[PDB]
Design an enzyme around this catalytic site. Structure first.
Site, mmCIF file in Angstrom:
data_model
loop_
_atom_site.group_PDB
_atom_site.id
_atom_site.type_symbol
_atom_site.label_atom_id
_atom_site.label_comp_id
_atom_site.label_asym_id
_atom_site.label_seq_id
_atom_site.Cartn_x
_atom_site.Cartn_y
_atom_site.Cartn_z
ATOM 1 N N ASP A 196 0.704 -1.183 0.035
ATOM 2 C CA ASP A 196 -0.016 -0.074 0.083
ATOM 3 C C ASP A 196 0.708 1.223 0.101
ATOM 4 O OD1 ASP A 196 -2.252 1.571 0.137
ATOM 5 O OD2 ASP A 196 -2.350 1.208 2.365
ATOM 6 N N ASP A 245 -1.848 5.501 -5.117
ATOM 7 C CA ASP A 245 -2.308 4.732 -4.270
ATOM 8 C C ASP A 245 -2.466 3.336 -4.676
ATOM 9 O OD1 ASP A 245 -3.402 3.156 -2.028
ATOM 10 O OD2 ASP A 245 -4.887 4.997 -1.508
#
Lengths: 4, 389
Positions: free
Chosen positions: B35, B231
């Site tokens: 992430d 992201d």
């Protein structure tokens, strides 16, 4: 489905 | 070397791409979601129905403790746990071992996903957004400080596109995360870099948007209100409310011949077509221009509908092909999610405060169109596109  | 890191990620856009790691002496193997949209390294440390394993703090010779709790909230999902440290390793990554901060997740809502096959999360973004506060060195910071691994990483994410099952998420190759470098075999053409505006999220500045060659003509700030980030942990491309309506209009219009449930455009409902019937050509390409590295210079990446129509399995469990609309609305800025990353090889060049894009070796191609990274372009007053308060 993913969400930062 | 980097060959050994090629194909070291598994998963899909909808549920995350994860990497294998060990923690603790003796080592405990765990799958960790990758992430770029967060800062914390965290792992299950107590039973949960969706967890096939967890981190036993009390079996590691090396588990230290900080006796300090933590809460981390994401757009969706949140967890709470206890902070400690431990020795950590990446079997299919560099050959080194680091002691890094680790949250043991004790309690959690909407964070672990049913049969995702990960049990943890690796926040690669910068300390500024770490919980409880910056002081808490994120993992990559540790790795760079404790070792000679260079301060950059690359992510080649792949989406297989015949809806992936849980026995296929193990089998499928979703991608590669090259730690400490660029692997040239994994992309074509040349890399284009955009600067990292600020080191918290990996926050970039979008200076133009076109859909099938048409400028939306909006003031740029609108594209980066209140920020744009890259992201890997967010599935969709999320646009701020104005840009989202504008793009949806253009896309509806371009796909007028056909009819879709009103909840389709909200990404709630599926649409399905007879297998291999889907009319891709009536869905437009979307071109995002990013600030370049030189004065009054821009470049662009082109997203095909194959990416923003994510696949998923049928309401009748029948052969004919189904999709969800992977563009969604945001009240917290533009998010270039995994669907957007899937097409591309993305270099997170933390050391030179930039992020590069090149077409991925992986990227799936529609017949008459191709995803691209092209420049140079000229674009004036690009600094004006950054949103300030």
């Amino acid at each position: 489905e993913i969400a930062x | 070397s980097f060959v050994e890191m090629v194909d070291n990620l598994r998963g899909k856009s909808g549920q995350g791409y994860y990497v294998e790691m060990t923690v603790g002496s003796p080592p405990q193997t765990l799958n960790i979601l990758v992430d770029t949209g967060s800062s914390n390294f965290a792992v299950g440390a107590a039973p949960h129905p969706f967890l096939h394993r967890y981190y036993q703090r009390q079996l590691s010779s090396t588990y230290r403790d900080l006796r300090k709790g933590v809460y981390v909230p994401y757009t969706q999902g949140k967890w709470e746990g206890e902070l400690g440290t431990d020795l950590v390793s990446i079997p299919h990554g560099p050959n080194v071992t680091v002691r890094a901060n680790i949250a043991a997740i004790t309690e959690s809502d909407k964070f672990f996903i049913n049969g995702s096959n990960w049990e943890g999360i690796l926040g690669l973004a910068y300390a500024e957004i770490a919980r409880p506060d910056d002081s808490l060195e994120p993992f990559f910071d540790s790795l760079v400080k404790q070792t000679h691994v260079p301060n950059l990483f690359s992510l080649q994410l792949c989406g297989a596109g015949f809806p992936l099952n849980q026995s296929e998420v193990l089998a499928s190759v979703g991608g590669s995360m090259i730690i400490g470098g660029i692997d040239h075999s994994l992309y074509t053409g040349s890399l284009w870099y955009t600067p990292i505006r600020r080191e918290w999220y990996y926050e970039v500045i979008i200076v133009r948007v076109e859909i099938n060659g048409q400028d939306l003509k909006m003031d740029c700030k609108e594209y980066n209100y209140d920020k744009s980030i890259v992201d890997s942990g967010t599935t969709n491309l999320r646009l701020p409310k104005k840009v989202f309506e504008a793009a949806v209009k253009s896309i509806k219009a371009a796909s007028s011949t056909e009819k879709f449930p009103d909840g389709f455009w909200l990404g709630e409902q599926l649409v399905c077509w007879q297998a291999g019937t889907t009319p891709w050509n009536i869905f437009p390409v979307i071109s995002l221009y990013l600030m370049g590295e030189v004065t009054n210079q821009s470049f662009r990446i082109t997203i095909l509908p194959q990416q923003y129509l994510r696949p998923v399995e049928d309401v009748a469990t029948s052969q004919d092909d189904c999709y969800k609309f992977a563009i969604s609305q945001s009240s917290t800025g533009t998010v270039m999610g995994a669907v957007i990353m899937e097409g591309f090889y993305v270099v997170f060049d933390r050391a030179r405060k930039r992020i590069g894009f090149a077409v991925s070796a992986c990227h799936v191609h529609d017949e008459f169109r191709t995803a691209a990274v092209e420049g140079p372009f000229v674009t004036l007053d690009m600094e004006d596109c950054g949103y300030n308060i």
